[PDB]
C-alpha cells in the first residue's frame, strides 16, 4: 500500500459530497452525531470555511456559500460565532469521541461549537 491519504468509506462520489451537509449541521445546531470517521474530516469542512470568512467582506462571504448550500447558517457564521472567536486561532469546534450507540455499532461524539 502507500501513505495515509483521505478516506473514501464508500466510493468516489459518495466520498466533496458528505463533507457538505453535516458540515452546516455544526452551525445550525451545536450538536451532531455521525460515526468513527465521523466528523473527524468534517472538522475540516469547518475551518476551512471559517477564516477566509473571518473578517466580513466580499472576498470571503462567497467562499462560505460555496461549500455550504444555505443562507440561514451562512450569515449566522458572521455577526455570530465570529465576531465571537476573535482573538482565537484554531480550536474552532473540536470534540471528544463518544461511546457507540444502538443499531449500527459505531462510536460517535457530538461535534459541538466552543
Amino acid at each position: 500500500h502507500r501513505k495515509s491519504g483521505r478516506q473514501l468509506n464508500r466510493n468516489s462520489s459518495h466520498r466533496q459530497a458528505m463533507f457538505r451537509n453535516m458540515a452546516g449541521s455544526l452551525v445550525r445546531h451545536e450538536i451532531i452525531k455521525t460515526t468513527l470517521p465521523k466528523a473527524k474530516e468534517l472538522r475540516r469542512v469547518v475551518e476551512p470555511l471559517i477564516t477566509l470568512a473571518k473578517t466580513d467582506s466580499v472576498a470571503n462571504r462567497r467562499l462560505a456559500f460555496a461549500r455550504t448550500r444555505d443562507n440561514e447558517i451562512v450569515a449566522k457564521l458572521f455577526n455570530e460565532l465570529g465576531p465571537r472567536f476573535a482573538s482565537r486561532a484554531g480550536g474552532y469546534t473540536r470534540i471528544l469521541k463518544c461511546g457507540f450507540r444502538a443499531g449500527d455499532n459505531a462510536p460517535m461524539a457530538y461535534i459541538e461549537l466552543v
Binding site: 471528544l96 469521541k97 463518544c98 457507540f100 462510536p107 461524539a109
Partner: peptide, 29 residues
C-alpha cells in the same frame, strides 16, 4: 445505581455527571 470506574448516579442510556461513560473514554466535566 452501579457505575463503572466511579460510583453514584447512573442510567443505562446517557452518560453521568461525574466523568461520563458507557464504554468509551472521553467526555469531561
Amino acid at each position: 445505581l452501579s457505575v463503572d470506574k466511579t460510583s453514584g448516579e447512573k442510567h443505562l442510556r446517557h452518560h453521568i455527571t461525574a466523568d461520563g461513560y458507557y464504554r468509551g473514554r472521553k467526555v469531561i466535566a
